[PDB]
Amino acid sequence: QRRESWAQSRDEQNLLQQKRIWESPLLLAAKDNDVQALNKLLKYEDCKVHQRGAMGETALHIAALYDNLEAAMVLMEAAPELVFEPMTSELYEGQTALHIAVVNQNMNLVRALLARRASVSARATGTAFRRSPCNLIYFGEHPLSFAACVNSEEIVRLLIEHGADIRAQDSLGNTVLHILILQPNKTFACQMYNLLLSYDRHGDHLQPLDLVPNHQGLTPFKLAGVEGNTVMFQHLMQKRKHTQWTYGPLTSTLYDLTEIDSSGDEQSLLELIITTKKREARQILDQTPVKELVSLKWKRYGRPYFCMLGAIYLLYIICFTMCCIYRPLKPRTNNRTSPRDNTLLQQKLLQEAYMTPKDDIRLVGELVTVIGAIIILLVEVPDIFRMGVTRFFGQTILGGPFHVLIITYAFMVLVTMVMRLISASGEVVPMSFALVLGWCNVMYFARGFQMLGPFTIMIQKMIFGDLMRFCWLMAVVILGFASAFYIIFQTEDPEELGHFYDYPMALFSTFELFLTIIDGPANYNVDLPFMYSITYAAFAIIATLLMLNLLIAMMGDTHWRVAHERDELWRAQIVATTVMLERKLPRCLWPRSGICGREYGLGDRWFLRVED
Amino acid sequence: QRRESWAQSRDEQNLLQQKRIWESPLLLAAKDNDVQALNKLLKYEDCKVHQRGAMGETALHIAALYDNLEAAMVLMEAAPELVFEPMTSELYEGQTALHIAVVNQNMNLVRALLARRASVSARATGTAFRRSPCNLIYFGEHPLSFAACVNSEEIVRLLIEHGADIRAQDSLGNTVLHILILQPNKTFACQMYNLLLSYDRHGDHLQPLDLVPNHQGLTPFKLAGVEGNTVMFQHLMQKRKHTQWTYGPLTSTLYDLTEIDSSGDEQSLLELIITTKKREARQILDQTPVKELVSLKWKRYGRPYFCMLGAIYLLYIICFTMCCIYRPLKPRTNNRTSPRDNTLLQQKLLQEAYMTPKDDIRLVGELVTVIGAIIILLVEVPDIFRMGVTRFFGQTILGGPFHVLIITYAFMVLVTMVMRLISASGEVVPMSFALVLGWCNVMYFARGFQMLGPFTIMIQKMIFGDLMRFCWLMAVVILGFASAFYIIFQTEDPEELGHFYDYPMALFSTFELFLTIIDGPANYNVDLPFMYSITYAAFAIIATLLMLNLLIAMMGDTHWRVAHERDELWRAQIVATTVMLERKLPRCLWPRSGICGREYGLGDRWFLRVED
Ligand SMILES: CCCCCCCC/C=C\CCCCCCCC(=O)O[C@@H](COC(=O)CCCCCCCCCCCCCCC)COP(=O)([O-])OCC[N+](C)(C)C
Ligand SMILES: CCCCCCCC/C=C\CCCCCCCC(=O)O[C@@H](COC(=O)CCCCCCCCCCCCCCC)COP(=O)([O-])OCC[N+](C)(C)C
Ligand SMILES: CCCCCCCC/C=C\CCCCCCCC(=O)O[C@@H](COC(=O)CCCCCCCCCCCCCCC)COP(=O)([O-])OCC[N+](C)(C)C
Ligand SMILES: CCCCCCCC/C=C\CCCCCCCC(=O)O[C@@H](COC(=O)CCCCCCCCCCCCCCC)COP(=O)([O-])OCC[N+](C)(C)C
Ligand SMILES: CCCCCCCC/C=C\CCCCCCCC(=O)O[C@@H](COC(=O)CCCCCCCCCCCCCCC)COP(=O)([O-])OCC[N+](C)(C)C
Ligand SMILES: CCCCCCCC/C=C\CCCCCCCC(=O)O[C@@H](COC(=O)CCCCCCCCCCCCCCC)COP(=O)([O-])OCC[N+](C)(C)C
Ligand SMILES: CCCCCCCC/C=C\CCCCCCCC(=O)O[C@@H](COC(=O)CCCCCCCCCCCCCCC)COP(=O)([O-])OCC[N+](C)(C)C
Ligand SMILES: CCCCCCCC/C=C\CCCCCCCC(=O)O[C@@H](COC(=O)CCCCCCCCCCCCCCC)COP(=O)([O-])OCC[N+](C)(C)C
Ligand SMILES: CCCCCCCC/C=C\CCCCCCCC(=O)O[C@@H](COC(=O)CCCCCCCCCCCCCCC)COP(=O)([O-])OCC[N+](C)(C)C
Ligand SMILES: CCCCCCCC/C=C\CCCCCCCC(=O)O[C@@H](COC(=O)CCCCCCCCCCCCCCC)COP(=O)([O-])OCC[N+](C)(C)C
Ligand SMILES: CC(C)CCC[C@@H](C)[C@H]1CC[C@H]2[C@@H]3CC=C4C[C@@H](OC(=O)CCC(=O)O)CC[C@]4(C)[C@H]3CC[C@]12C
Ligand SMILES: CC(C)CCC[C@@H](C)[C@H]1CC[C@H]2[C@@H]3CC=C4C[C@@H](OC(=O)CCC(=O)O)CC[C@]4(C)[C@H]3CC[C@]12C
Ligand SMILES: CC(C)CCC[C@@H](C)[C@H]1CC[C@H]2[C@@H]3CC=C4C[C@@H](OC(=O)CCC(=O)O)CC[C@]4(C)[C@H]3CC[C@]12C
Ligand SMILES: [Ca+2]
């Protein structure tokens, strides 16, 4: 409602702009190329040259919009004050006509305005210029930023000659080199990037203008990685690579690897690409400094430390499994209630549970599971206190779904610990969750293997893709037929056919008949009711044939899509593991990657050598 | 038989045409370019120049058919009356030779006929010129219509100079601008469309000739949408769009949206595209006025009103389900007939059914289901009285299959209402239909969701595609093997293996063995008959392996075809919903789309603004 009222207000204000032009002979003669009408209109007063349209625009703005050079020249000669006028409206605050002629690439009217001393530092701070999905252009705020984004190299040279600050930042802190990365035509933005670094002749040289961050802390090199700009990433790596020698077909290149790999506790380029929402960012992982660095970290220190943790976790779940197998049980102390009561054993009290030497061996195994579950909560839960408590930890959970599965496992172990201590009934329900969550967390360590790794991306995309959007159609066919199956057998004896004896069992039986994992109900010794055969024949056609195989056909497409991009998806699993594993392990266990300088006359930087 | 006798009569009349030419020296010398023979033949009388062929043709028609200019000139000089002669035959009534030279594009013979004052208003009303599947050309009735369709711009200019009525309509009411849309070469028809609007210089200007309807009420703009002419639709929208401004790469266009969106109670362009048989018409839904209008109606008012009705219907079916769960049942009053009688409960009488406070809570829930079923019939059934009673409501049912599923649900609720009142046995059969039709109508509201929506197009196309044409082969393999299975066990005791104990159960068991949803019959404690193992091994290979997986392979192709055109099929579901929902809800709930004029100096029209 709010996004649609903003689009409705922008449309009504654009129609009100065209109305106010037609209502006044001044702005209408600026819109058309009526030179003689602007001559005759201006002869009888100052003639309200400071007349505002619906957008806060003047007539000199209107001649700038419609590329009316001869109309705009008359207005500047009559009123030279119109050159310094911004648009006064929230949609276009601060926009002058020097902005408009730059965007329209009117070369003669840019020189005409700067001859009348037009400001090159005027900031278009209106809401039609901000970086938003509502806006189709993000050109920045300054006329040098507008000229760089329309690829007018001759205006970019002409604005810097008149004093345009090349280091100017907008509200987002973006310099002109940041804004060029955010542009759709990426080949032209490479050429404009080179032209604007050529004017950095120690101009406010605290930083060389390709090292200036925005308010997010991103330089143009890091912004090209976060936004998935692979064209600008290859172009900006040419400054960061150094050819050592060329021996025929061979070449030894030395890569800078300073802004790619984390120097201190700042987030590196690898951490930003993993933790971003754009999926074009993960094509930077296939680039010639970055692909070699990821393979180097994994083979040297990533995969040994990951297979050590996978073997410790696999021994831990085997210890948890056996203390659930040997859980303390005794024969039941009450008598059987109904003939449907199948329970023979109940669970011992806490005083009874630890009395034999086999109960003390289990107690050692049970304390390992408790201590291991506390260590999981001491490692993984303090992330929510360091990160955002709700929001920023939420992208960690959308990023890694195995975070919550080992957190939920660790809470289920501590729930059944408390039930052990207070002697509460029903420890089978915390244990059964912890058994299946404990063993299905071993599928986390499948990503140590190129072949096994993206199988869990298939399992994820079949659940939260195919299943989560087709289960709503399945649930409503189950609810329809299970309700029919319930009332058909509601008058019958359940001892012969008891699949639908109460309504929760009729729901569970129809779900199992859907998936064809129990057989169709049949007796052949009694007369089943007449509507059963018609309803189950209709169920067997729509559910077991049609809608079950429809889901299997969907998941076969999900298999095919993930197996196509299989190696690209495994490399993203490796970066996310290596980032996590380097962050949590100390620097003594993780040596820094590449070769450092300072013993080779190269600085304090850390270099990576590729021979190609 | 009737379509084939008409093709047989047209073929015999075309062979009789070539016979009558060869039988007469006049028409044979017109067919060939025998100038000296037509000279010598014409010297001995008037010489029967008014001689009719099999098609009612003259010799001047024959010289026009075979592009014989020098033969046709001799015939006009000898007989000037032959210029005014139409063909006198039902297949070619009214066709003159000015029609024939125009179609053959004989430039010299068109000028030669109009020099002899040939009629440009002659109407070819024969059955070979009407719009029919029997005819390969539909060129209209007038020579200006024939010249526009053969793309002869020089004849079109030359016929208008001699007084051709450009506003002339044929039997279908089609002007020359209507007929150009019905032509296969669409690029040439765009150029001929522009040339014929250029001659509308206030000529009978009640309407500008692109606003003249045919007898179906369609203008050329609406006819391009109904016929799926996307080339002519983009060309005719250029008159209906207005560029407000151009700001560098940006452009603001204002679209007319008058003939696209419904002004009054007339059918709009969106209603005509949904309710038409052609499926090329639904490519108009992806066009730049229409795609933005559909997304605007759905996001503002379509999807809120559709999810309100989906939540009210979902609460209604839950109320219907629980009054079927708690239906009035008592223990049976008679004794058990046979040992196959499994019935324990029967249903209470009407006097017994409402005696407790829990029966009055159900009575409130049962009256909600009755009132809701009457409202479904008061909303949906009066369409058949407003539309066609049989025919035109039939395309509504072929268009929406969820119309009949909620009508059949509403009748099943009122059948079990009457059985409740008269205390009739067997309310389980109207309830079981109403339970599965009630809950599977919740799949109607899946089309509020882009992902869930065209799942029901898959379910439809697998039933009425794959299943309805392969069930005939399955039914005959079931009937063959169930008859064999019946007579094999006809001499056996059914207490051990009773799958085929009578012939309706042998049919039902073999259907379930086909679908592999009951296990294969086996005892292992008795000797089964010898032909069972041979027949069931043959059944398991042809039916469970081969013909079951053959159907699953078909439906996997139906899945792949619908998932390919997935978003194009969901947008057609949204237009059909929005059309239905705007028609039934009052105008106070549905504001009209776009921005109106009259506060912006644009008229009383309603405009839609796209910034691109
Ligand atoms: C990939 C493979 C790798 C290896 C996997 C090995 C797989 C096989 C593993 C084991 C073999 C299978 C069971 C052997 C059979 C009986 C053994 C026994 O004496 O149990 C006794 C008690 O034992 C317990 O209560 C165990 C509960 C805690 C186990 C943890 C020990 C603590 C060590 C912490 C270590 C830290 C962990 C590391 C943390 C990082 C009782 O047994 P019972 O009553 O005589 O049973 C009758 C059986 N029957 C009916 C069949 C007759
Ligand atoms: C392991 C041994 C250690 C013992 C040491 C000390 C313990 C000693 C304590 C008591 C001794 C008494 C004997 C109890 C025996 C077993 C209890 C049982 O299951 O059945 C019992 C019911 O009791 C319950 O089931 C309680 C319900 C479970 C509550 C737990 C919620 C989990 C919340 C956290 C997870 C949130 C998950 C959400 C995630 C999304 C018995 O009732 P019954 O079986 O119904 O009898 C009828 C049988 N019939 C149905 C066949 C007719
Ligand atoms: C915050 C700590 C909890 C408070 C501690 C003291 C509790 C004081 C309460 C009762 C004390 C009186 C003793 C009588 C015996 C038990 C009777 C009883 O009331 O048990 C009840 C509690 O059972 C539970 O559900 C425990 C789980 C609750 C909180 C989870 C633990 C937090 C661990 C961190 C993880 C959090 C993350 C969760 C994510 C999964 C349920 O009863 P029952 O199950 O139906 O069995 C009946 C047993 N009887 C038949 C033998 C009689
Ligand atoms: C105690 C209980 C255990 C603990 C709690 C368990 C919580 C769950 C664990 C981890 C949850 C962590 C976040 C969800 C996973 C991320 C998915 C995602 O990226 O977004 C997804 C949507 O997003 C959703 O669907 C929202 C989740 C729905 C509700 C969560 C409960 C689901 C039940 C879970 C049980 C499932 C039933 C199976 C049998 C039981 C987008 O999908 P995608 O994956 O990015 O790509 C697929 C789309 N594609 C096909 C077009 C390509
Ligand atoms: C994707 C997943 C969706 C879930 C799928 C399935 C949901 C299942 C999940 C959980 C159900 C299991 C609950 C167990 C507790 C018992 C209570 C019970 O249900 O039975 C009770 C009955 O009461 C009813 O009949 C309520 C159901 C009516 C229909 C509402 C469906 C809810 C989903 C709507 C949304 C649909 C969403 C579809 C898209 C919009 C008691 O039954 P009884 O014992 O026989 O007693 C009868 C007494 N009698 C003999 C006098 C007659
Ligand atoms: C997506 C989810 C949304 C919500 C879905 C909620 C899902 C769950 C919904 C409900 C919970 C499931 C049942 C609860 C269990 C018993 C309740 C009870 O007292 O029933 C009593 C009578 O009740 C009836 O007869 C009901 C029949 C009419 C229902 C409609 C009410 C009228 C309101 C009109 C409203 C207008 C509707 C709107 C129209 C637009 C009898 O019960 P019992 O004999 O004691 O049963 C024994 C059970 N046992 C064997 C297990 C012991
Ligand atoms: C819900 C409670 C409310 C009650 C209130 C008032 C009601 C009180 C009224 C009577 C009380 C008497 C007790 C009756 C008990 C149930 C009746 C029954 O099913 O079986 C009965 C047969 O009776 C029939 O089935 C009649 C046949 C059905 C006709 C309906 C046609 C539907 C037409 C429209 C739909 C068109 C669909 C077409 C669409 C394409 C009993 O016979 P039996 O069971 O065979 O016994 C032998 C058992 N054996 C086979 C196991 C050997
Ligand atoms: C037009 C209204 C109908 C006339 C009203 C009065 C009818 C007068 C008739 C008998 C009155 C005598 C009373 C004795 C008790 C019943 C005996 C009997 O003959 O019942 C018969 C009628 O059962 C039906 O099939 C009813 C359905 C017929 C028309 C559908 C209703 C129209 C609703 C609009 C929707 C239309 C759309 C349809 C699309 C689905 C069948 O008998 P039974 O089922 O085998 O059960 C025997 C019961 N007994 C064992 C207890 C004895
Ligand atoms: C009380 C009973 C309930 C109420 C009455 C029920 C009446 C039915 C409900 C709605 C019917 C409304 C019209 C039919 C649906 C439209 C289909 C259509 O467009 O034409 C189709 C042919 O057309 C036919 O096949 C004619 C229908 C056959 C007879 C109808 C009974 C079918 C039984 C229904 C039970 C099915 C068995 C399943 C399990 C039981 C063309 O197919 P398509 O879809 O356009 O595209 C597929 C072709 N493609 C794959 C090449 C792309
Ligand atoms: C796509 C859907 C097609 C449907 C497929 C399935 C159709 C089935 C649908 C409905 C059948 C169920 C009816 C129930 C009523 C009982 C009557 C009955 O059938 O059994 C009776 C037998 O009589 C027969 O044997 C008739 C069948 C002979 C073959 C004709 C097949 C019809 C389809 C032809 C067109 C094929 C189309 C294929 C393509 C051209 C009684 O049997 P009994 O009780 O054992 O008594 C025997 C007494 N004895 C012991 C003395 C020996
Ligand atoms: C008494 C002692 C011997 C118990 C031993 C316990 C270990 C088996 C536990 C302790 C901490 C656990 C770790 C805590 C946190 C993590 C991070 C976790 O990361 C993710 O799941 C990322 C999610 C994703 O990217 O999808 C993977 C499991 C792991 C290594 C755990 C593996 C199992 C560990 C080593
Ligand atoms: C006792 C019963 C009732 C417990 C039910 C258990 C389920 C809730 C568990 C068991 C298996 C689990 C799944 C096992 C594997 C995966 C893949 C995993 O996918 C990834 O994270 C892959 C992405 C990547 O590797 O980068 C996401 C969680 C998911 C779907 C799990 C979700 C939770 C599931 C369905
Ligand atoms: C006592 C009261 C509270 C009962 C409430 C009854 C409602 C749940 C009913 C009344 C009228 C029904 C509507 C009547 C007609 C239609 C049109 C119908 O349109 C189609 O099915 C189009 C078919 C297709 O395009 O495939 C969809 C269901 C709907 C909205 C129905 C939805 C359910 C409604 C709102
Ligand atoms: Ca089985």
Residue numbers in the entry:
A (entry chain C), B (entry chain B): 24 to 635
List sentences from the manuscript.
TRPV6 is a calcium-selective ion channel implicated in epithelial Ca2+ uptake. TRPV6 is a representative of the vanilloid subfamily of transient receptor potential (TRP) channels that is considered the principal epithelial calcium channel for Ca2+ absorption in intestines and many other organs. The channel is assembled of four subunits and contains two main components: a TMD with a central ion channel pore and an intracellular skirt that is mostly built of ankyrin repeat domains connected to each other by three-stranded β-sheets, N-terminal helices, and C-terminal hooks. The TMD is composed of six transmembrane helices S1–S6 and a re-entrant pore loop (P-loop) between S5 and S6.
As a control, we aimed to determine the open (apo) state structure of human TRPV6 (TRPV6Open) at a higher resolution than that of the previously solved structures. Initially, we improved the structural resolution for hTRPV6-CtD purified in glyco-diosgenin (GDN) detergent from 3.26 Å49 to 2.69 Å. The new open-state structures have the same architecture as previously published TRPV6 structures. Consistent with previous findings, the pore of the open-state TRPV6 was in the conducting state. Typical for the open conformation of TRPV6, S6 was not entirely α-helical and contained a π-bulge resulting from an α-to-π transition in its middle.
